Design a protein around this ligand. Structure first.
Ligand SMILES: *C(=O)COCCOCCNC(=O)CC[C@H](NC(=O)CCCCCCCCCCCCCCCCCCC(=O)O)C(=O)O
Lengths: 33, 338, 126, 59, 238, 391
């Protein structure tokens, strides 16, 4: 149905940007700051 | 020979009309113009008796003011316990078309009848413990409209064949026959002393009959359409009659004329049932406009309105001791108001 | 009491005209639909014409359509029937019948043998 | 024709029987009705509502 | 809550009575009730006798039960009753349909049938129930038309000029005059029917004879149509 | 595929452990001016001779390593033996651009979120009002009204599950779950509550579809079979509306838990366990469409074979079709036959938009058509108004 599909699109998209921030955090200095 | 008979009949009618006019010194409204008017009485449905399948055509109250009998068009005669909302008995009917039902004063027997032209009396409490068909009466050539028990052995019935009958339960034959009406005897009401009874038919007239002697004591003609609701006043010296012209009339046996008229501009539908309270102050009429009305029998103005009853109201009745009033309509529901 | 009195009968040569008047007493004339009933000798009651409360809706039987006219006078509570071009088959008793219930289009038992709200009728001979 | 004559005769006799019944004036009957209504007014639960602890249909 | 032993017994009896009433409710609501009406010459008695293949001197009403496609129908014929019908006709308010049988063969009485049908159709308590018309004794009408008397024009002037409707489906080997007269009678009934039935009840016509064995099937089909239309109206789909 | 945040952080943890192991085991060069080995949480920089250039490949944990398979990490060592510090700071020269990515938008999905959220809210309010109205008036207590109440409850549960699920999605992708560490016990992803929330949403949507199916089946049974019981058929319909969705939603949840737990089951990846919920919904939609076309044919037959007073009946048929579509949910037939893999391009926006909007406003439309504008409901309201106006 459209909502199991919309949720998977939103849930894939947010994991994508969640891992993006984590790479940025490593660039920032990882665990420090 | 017929012409002189007609002339004498019209002369006698004119004499009766002149006598009624002479005896009409004053109206009921003028005498009761100084009494305190009744306030606005509001009734609430204290109990519902949802157990029928088809329209409820008639119902009657027992002498104990606790057990009532209801007749439904699906072929059921149900005894309701008014206080506890319990079903005491459920009698199937051979003919599903039932238009009347009566409760015996002793509570041992119950009456039923309708389009089958047969009055069925069922014994409620037998040695076996089941309600069987105690007696069947088949003498009327028209559909039964109203029946009322006098005792455990005699019953007065009215049919559509312009004939009322008095039946002995044991013998099963007509003890007395009353043939004075013109067409489709609709309702009857027994007097408190059971000596006489009043009857209303579709000929726009009412007649008073003596149970023992068996002749029409008095005849009253004041309506304009079919009479389908009659009830005896508790005092026993008056009664009320309801017609399809959206009108009730109050008649007195000692005046031989209508005392007062209950009608209104808004109401244009007929009246199926009429009943009195314990004191006779409130007159309850079931109009076939999805509602019911309560008037006062002294100044003829609106006093209360009962609503919430789907379809036309068919049967109305106050308890013999004045506890509450039960109303049954074509929606297969019985509502108790106090 | 219901009173319905007819007047206007009598012998008439074929092709004549007549005026039958019905006077009503004991009820509100305007609230009831009116109609005429015909009883031929050796025959039963036959419906002729009907007119509603206000006269907007009027109808006649096929045997008399185009020859007889009906009208109402609610001011005087009268029902009028004008007969034109009478026929020898119209020799019969005419009654004025009132509908049993008011504020209603339909009404049964108009041609009943022992109908209550019906007058004595008038004899018309052609 | 005999049936019509018999019906007319029985109607005539019934009418003459009903026309020979004594009838009181309307005022007396109205006064009696008012007296009956006033006398039993207290014993009318519909007219005068009984207390909520006495009616067997509510409590 | 606390209850007495007598109260418990009364409650148990009431529960048993309610169970019996529920059992009877399915039987009551699975059966269609029909009101059979007609004149003395309409031949409804012959119809009842033919359909029965599926008391006292004042019985007042007669019931016949017939089953079509495992569906029960109870038809009620009125007998031993006075000619007055303004009161007891209100009893048949919840019936499935009114089967009105009219003898179209005999003239000088069709006006009475038309008036009775109009009164039934415009009845306040019959404005919802549908009417199934049985133009009974079609063979007699055909023979009377073929007799050459041609008395239909005398009673009904409207038959002087009347074209056969294009929707007519005459039987093979049928005289056009018979078809024209039959459809004229049908249209006379339909003109009265289509004056106050604002989508509430219909006037399904049928040409029937005293020997037809398909009357039960026609009644079953008409009842099915009525039930389907009622269900569609409840859903506001029609 | 989708590179999970937990998988990426676990890969980085393994990479940094291996980097520390290598830095501990790597022998230093003999030259005193060598640049000291440094770890800036990104790469395992080895020791370098003074005045040199170092070139290596991207680390393992980078999800876009396929874009830069070999090389693309660079560093420079000065002559004195110190890293080239940046301006007004103490960080080496930046080489992220070589290994960095070459650059559906959130604005496209935000629109859809707003539209379907407001549609679901309006439907929830309307259906609550409709259920209250139906349960209030005693005259409107038929089995058809009971089926309508069950459908309204299914729609309400679907809307509530949608709201709770989007709230949970907001919880699990936010400032929460900040633990980019060895702590696998995430704030909400590791909790069974989110998985149960997703299962509840799946059950609610399946129940809504199957209650649309139940409504269609009941209408078809009334129109085509007749002479059926009342309590037994209602019990069977309720069991099918509620119990049957438990026969494939619960097995779907069980198999999802058993095989791949992933991120609270929110993402369909296997494309073979999604059929467990998809196929029953498609079957229900197809049966409802067949019932819809059957009822439309019945209505056309009724309008043609009878009602001789009218010939131009297209308006009534159109109104009947437009009223019947929301009740049976036949607007889903316009889609769901295109699948997911066939609309990866400019599509999946029109399809998703139309389907989500129609589903969100379906509850409101049904409540308006079958409760608010229903003739019997309005008649009951008028009767109540008259009763209250006569005192
Ligand atoms: C992609 O980059 C954009 O989409 C990613 C969204 O992730 C999915 C879920 N989140 C959202 O859809 C939108 C963000 C959502 N918003 C909210 O929860 C409401 C906004 C306020 C949330 C923070 C509330 C308090 C937090 C403590 C204060 C920290 C400063 C935050 C400033 C905002 C709050 C005002 C200050 C205060 O109230 O203390 C989400 O956050 O998940």
């Amino acid at each position: 149905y459209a909502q199991g599909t919309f949720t998977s699109d939103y849930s894939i998209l947010l994991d994508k940007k969640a891992q993006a921030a984590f790479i940025e955090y490593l660039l920032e200095g990882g665990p420090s700051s | 020979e017929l012409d002189q008979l007609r002339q004498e009949a019209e002369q006698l009618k004119n004499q009766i009309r002149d006598a009624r006019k002479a005896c009409a010194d004053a109206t009921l409204s003028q005498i009761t113009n100084n009494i305190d008017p009744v306030g606005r009485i509001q009734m609430r449905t204290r109990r519902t008796l949802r157990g029928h399948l088809a329209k409820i055509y008639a119902m009657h109250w027992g002498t104990d003011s606790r057990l009532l009998v209801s007749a439904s068009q699906d072929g059921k005669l149900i005894i309701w316990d008014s206080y506890t909302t319990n079903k005491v008995h459920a009698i199937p009917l051979r003919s599903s078309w039932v238009m009347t039902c009566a409760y015996a004063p002793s509570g041992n027997y119950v009456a039923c009848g309708g389009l089958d032209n047969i009055c069925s009396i069922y014994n409620l409490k037998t040695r076996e413990g089941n309600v069987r068909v105690s007696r069947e009466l088949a003498g009327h050539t028209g559909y039964l409209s109203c029946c009322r028990f006098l005792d455990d052995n005699q019953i007065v019935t009215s049919s559509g064949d312009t004939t009322c009958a008095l039946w002995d339960i044991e013998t099963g034959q007509q003890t007395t026959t009353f043939t004075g009406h013109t067409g489709d005897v609709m309702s009857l009401s027994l007097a408190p002393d059971t000596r006489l009874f009043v009857s209303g038919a579709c000929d726009a007239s009412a007649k008073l009959w003596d149970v023992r002697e068996g002749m029409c004591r008095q005849t009253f003609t004041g309506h304009e359409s079919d009479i389908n609701a009659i009830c005896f006043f508790p005092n026993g010296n008056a009664f009320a009659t309801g017609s399809d012209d959206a009108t009730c009339r109050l008649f007195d046996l000692r005046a031989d004329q209508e005392l007062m008229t209950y009608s209104h501009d808004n109401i244009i539908c007929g009246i199926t049932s009429v009943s009195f309270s314990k004191s006779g102050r409130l007159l309850l009429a079931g109009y076939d406009d999805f509602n019911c009305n309560v008037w006062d029998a002294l100044k003829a103005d609106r006093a209360g309105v009962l609503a919430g009853h789907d379809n036309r109201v068919s049967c109305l009745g106050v308890t013999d001791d004045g506890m509450a009033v039960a109303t049954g309509s074509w929606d297969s529901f019985l509502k108790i108001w106090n | 009491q219901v009173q319905l009195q007819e007047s206007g009968g009598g012998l008439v040569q074929p092709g004549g005209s007549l005026r039958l008047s019905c006077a009503a007493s004991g009820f509100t004339f305007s609230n009831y639909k009116m109609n005429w009933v015909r009883q031929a000798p050796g025959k039963g009651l036959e419906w002729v014409s009907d007119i509603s409360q206000s006269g907007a809706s009027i109808s006649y039987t096929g045997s008399v359509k185009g020859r007889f006219t009906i009208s109402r006078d609610n001011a005087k509570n009268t029902l009028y029937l004008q007969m034109n071009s009478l026929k020898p088959e119209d020799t019969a008793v005419y009654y004025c019948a009132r509908c049993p219930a008011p504020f209603t289009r339909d009404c049964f038992d108009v041609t009943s043998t022992t109908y209550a709200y019906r007058g004595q009728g008038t004899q018309v001979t052609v | 024709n005999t049936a019509s004559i018999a019906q007319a005769r029985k109607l005539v006799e019934q009418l003459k029987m009903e026309a020979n019944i004594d009838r009181i004036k309307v005022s007396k009957a109205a006064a009696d009705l008012m007296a009956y209504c006033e006398a039993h007014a207290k014993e009318d639960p519909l007219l005068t509502p009984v207390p909520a602890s006495e009616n067997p249909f509510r409590e | 809550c606390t209850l007495s032993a007598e109260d418990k017994a009364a409650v148990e009896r009431s529960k048993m009575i309610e169970k019996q009433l529920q059992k009877d409710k399915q039987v009551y609501r699975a059966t269609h009730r029909l009101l059979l009406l007609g004149a003395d010459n309409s031949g409804k008695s012959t119809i009842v006798k033919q359909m029965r293949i599926y008391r006292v001197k004042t019985s007042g009403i007669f019931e016949t039960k017939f089953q079509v496609d495992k569906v029960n129908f109870h038809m009620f014929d009125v007998g031993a009753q006075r000619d007055e019908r303004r009161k007891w006709i209100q009893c048949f308010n919840d019936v499935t349909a009114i089967i009105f049988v009219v003898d179209s063969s005999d003239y000088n009485r069709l006006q009475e049938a038309l008036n009775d049908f109009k009164s039934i159709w415009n009845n306040r308590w019959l404005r919802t129930i549908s009417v199934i018309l049985f133009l009974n004794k079609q063979d007699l009408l055909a023979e009377k038309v073929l007799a050459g008397k041609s008395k239909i024009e005398d009673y009904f002037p409207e038959f002087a000029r009347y074209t056969t409707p294009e929707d007519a489906t005459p039987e093979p080997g049928e005289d056009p005059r018979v078809t024209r007269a039959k459809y004229f009678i049908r249209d006379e009934f339909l003109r009265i029917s289509t004056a106050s039935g604002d989508g509430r009840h219909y006037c399904y016509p049928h040409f029937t004879c005293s020997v037809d064995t398909e009357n039960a099937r026609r009644i079953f089909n008409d009842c099915r149509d009525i039930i389907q239309r009622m269900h569609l109206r409840q859903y506001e789909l029609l | 595929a989708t590179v999970s945040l937990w998988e990426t952080v676990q890969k980085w943890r393994e990479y940094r452990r291996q980097c520390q192991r290598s830095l501990t085991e790597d022998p230093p060069p003999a030259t005193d001016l060598f640049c000291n080995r440094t770890f800036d949480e990104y790469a395992c920089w080895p020791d370098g001779e003074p005045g040199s250039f170092v070139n290596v490949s991207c680390p393992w944990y980078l999800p876009w390593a396929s874009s830069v398979p070999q090389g693309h990490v660079y560093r420079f060592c000065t002559a004195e033996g110190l890293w080239l510090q940046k301006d007004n700071s103490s960080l080496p020269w930046r080489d992220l651009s070589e290994c960095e990515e070459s650059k559906s938008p959130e604005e496209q999905l935000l629109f859809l979120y707003i539209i379907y959220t407001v549609g679901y809210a309006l439907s929830f309010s309307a259906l609550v009002i409709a259920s209250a109205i139906l349960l209030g008036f005693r005259h409107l207590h038929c089995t058809r009204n009971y089926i309508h109440l069950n459908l309204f409850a299914s729609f309400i549960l679907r809307a509530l599950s949608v709201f709770i699920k989007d709230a949970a999605l907001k919880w699990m992708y936010s400032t929460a779950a900040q633990q980019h560490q060895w702590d696998g016990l995430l704030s909400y992803q590791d909790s069974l509550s989110c998985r149960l929330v997703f299962l509840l949403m799946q059950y609610c949507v399946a129940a809504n579809y199957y209650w649309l199916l139940v409504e269609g089946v009941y209408l078809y049974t009334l129109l085509a079979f007749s002479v059926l019981s009342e309590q037994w058929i209602f019990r069977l319909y309720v069991s099918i509306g509620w119990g049957v969705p438990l026969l494939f939603v619960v097995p779907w949840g069980i198999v999802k838990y058993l095989y791949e737990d992933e991120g609270c089951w929110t993402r369909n990846s296997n494309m073979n366990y999604w059929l467990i919920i998809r196929l029953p919904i498609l079957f229900a939609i197809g049966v409802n469409f067949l019932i819809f076309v059957r009822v439309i044919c019945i209505v056309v037959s009724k309008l043609k074979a009878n009602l001789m007073c009218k010939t131009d009946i297209k308006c009534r048929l159109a109104k009947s079709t437009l009223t019947l579509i929301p009740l049976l949910g036949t607007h889903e037939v316009i889609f769901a036959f295109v699948m997911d893999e066939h609309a990866r391009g400019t599509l999946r926006f029109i399809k998703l938009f139309t389907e989500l909007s129609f589903t969100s406003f379906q509850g409101l439309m049904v409540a308006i058509l079958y409760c608010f504008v229903n003739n019997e409901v309005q008649l009951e309201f008028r009767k109540s108004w008259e009763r209250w106006r006569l005192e």
